[PDB]
Design a protein around this ligand. Sequence first.
Ligand SMILES: C[S@+](CC[C@H](N)C(=O)[O-])C[C@H]1O[C@@H](n2cnc3c(N)ncnc32)[C@H](O)[C@@H]1O
Ligand SMILES: C[S@@+](CC[C@H](N)C(=O)[O-])C[C@H]1O[C@@H](n2cnc3c(N)ncnc32)[C@H](O)[C@@H]1O
Ligand code: SF4
Length: 434
Amino acid sequence: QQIDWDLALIKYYTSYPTALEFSEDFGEQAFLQAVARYPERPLSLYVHIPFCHKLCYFCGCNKIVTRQQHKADQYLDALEQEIVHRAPLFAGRHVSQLHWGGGTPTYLNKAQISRLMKLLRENFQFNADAEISIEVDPREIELDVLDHLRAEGFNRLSMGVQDFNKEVQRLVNREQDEEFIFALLNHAREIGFTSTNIDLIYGLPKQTPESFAFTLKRVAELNPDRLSVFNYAHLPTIFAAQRKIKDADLPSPQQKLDILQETIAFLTQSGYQFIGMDHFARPDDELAVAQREGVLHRNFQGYTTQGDTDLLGMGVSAISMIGDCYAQNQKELKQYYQQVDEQGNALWRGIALTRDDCIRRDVIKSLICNFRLDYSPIEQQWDLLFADYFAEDLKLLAPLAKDGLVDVDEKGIQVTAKGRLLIRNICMCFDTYL
Ligand SMILES: C[S@+](CC[C@H](N)C(=O)[O-])C[C@H]1O[C@@H](n2cnc3c(N)ncnc32)[C@H](O)[C@@H]1O
Ligand SMILES: C[S@@+](CC[C@H](N)C(=O)[O-])C[C@H]1O[C@@H](n2cnc3c(N)ncnc32)[C@H](O)[C@@H]1O
Ligand code: SF4
């Protein structure tokens, strides 16, 4: 691999600014000013589908577990009204990207999937080669749902797996049929889905280096196009289902480090490039190519080739990134419904980024995605001299640089093989909010 693991250095950014900075004072006018800022810009769409069949005990997502399937019809009634009110604001735009996240998008049955896609296609102008993606829970679903997604124009999918280990599944209430997972992913491949991602989590109860290595051997026989391997974030005060997880079953910190180190080595051996953070992809993947070429980008869903898009987020909790602003819908379903009914939108809170916010966003995006930062381009675009504007930040950086996390000089910063896993540490030197 290109990372070089260093135990000792290892003892050392969703968006920027973060969601901590979103304010309820950000209202409808600020939103409309944001929408008018870049009328040319390609449009990306995000739709949040919050419903899940069953309560995964590890899960920290904005989601609603329910067997009352009719809630999905009520929710699409609300999405219809949101779409009908927001979409005319974007009549001149061309949509290059759509993703459904959640929650479980495939909670929607075939008729519901069709209904939503039809609302989107009739109210926004989609490019013929748009990237249309969805996340899929490989439980309580028939293989022919993939054919239906394909007929509806979906071309990318992500599938949660978490772990194949049966004890781990039982402890987190995510029992799943391994044969069916293989059937589902291989069927997706056979009908033309590409860039297929699977999610794995390390740090779950009862996982060890030896259990996770065995899981990864299977994953290699499954042969996904991309992998996302998340470190388990355990905060049972906030995520109530995690109270069902025994803290004593969680792996020790040395165990989690050994899981991660061995994972990176084994995925490299298996032909996957470590892109960054949670993500692995093949050397010829559009993401790996872009990264080499210095033009990898990132949004809330993750890495992407499509930069400089405005992102409109629809549905409960959905975040929009538009015209140098972030805006989020109501995160509780009952106030999402109530505001959509009364106003035709669910705008709750957000931020208009300052000049300084925008710069620093671009510094941080460059470091996170490309693992380097050329001063000169930032100096041109924003009419500044880097050393000055960032004197404070560079001072914070110095100790890190002497530790070999980054090589830095008068022209730029290079994140080293040793510093790649500590990228959040590096980016933190540029965060004014802390
Ligand atoms: C790759 S992330 C999952 C990682 C997870 N957030 C974590 O750190 O534990 C994708 C998920 O982020 C959320 N998401 C993505 N885009 C979003 C957006 N524009 N607004 C709100 N939520 C979004 C949805 O829950 C989606 O399924
Ligand atoms: C919206 S779910 C994926 C789609 C579908 N609902 C499923 O579970 O298959 C998004 C991903 O977030 C990750 N995730 C959720 N909670 C997490 C946590 N507390 N720590 C780390 N990753 C988490 C899981 O890998 C999960 O697949
Ligand atoms: S991991 Fe997925 S299926 Fe599970 S609760 Fe979270 S969002 Fe729902």
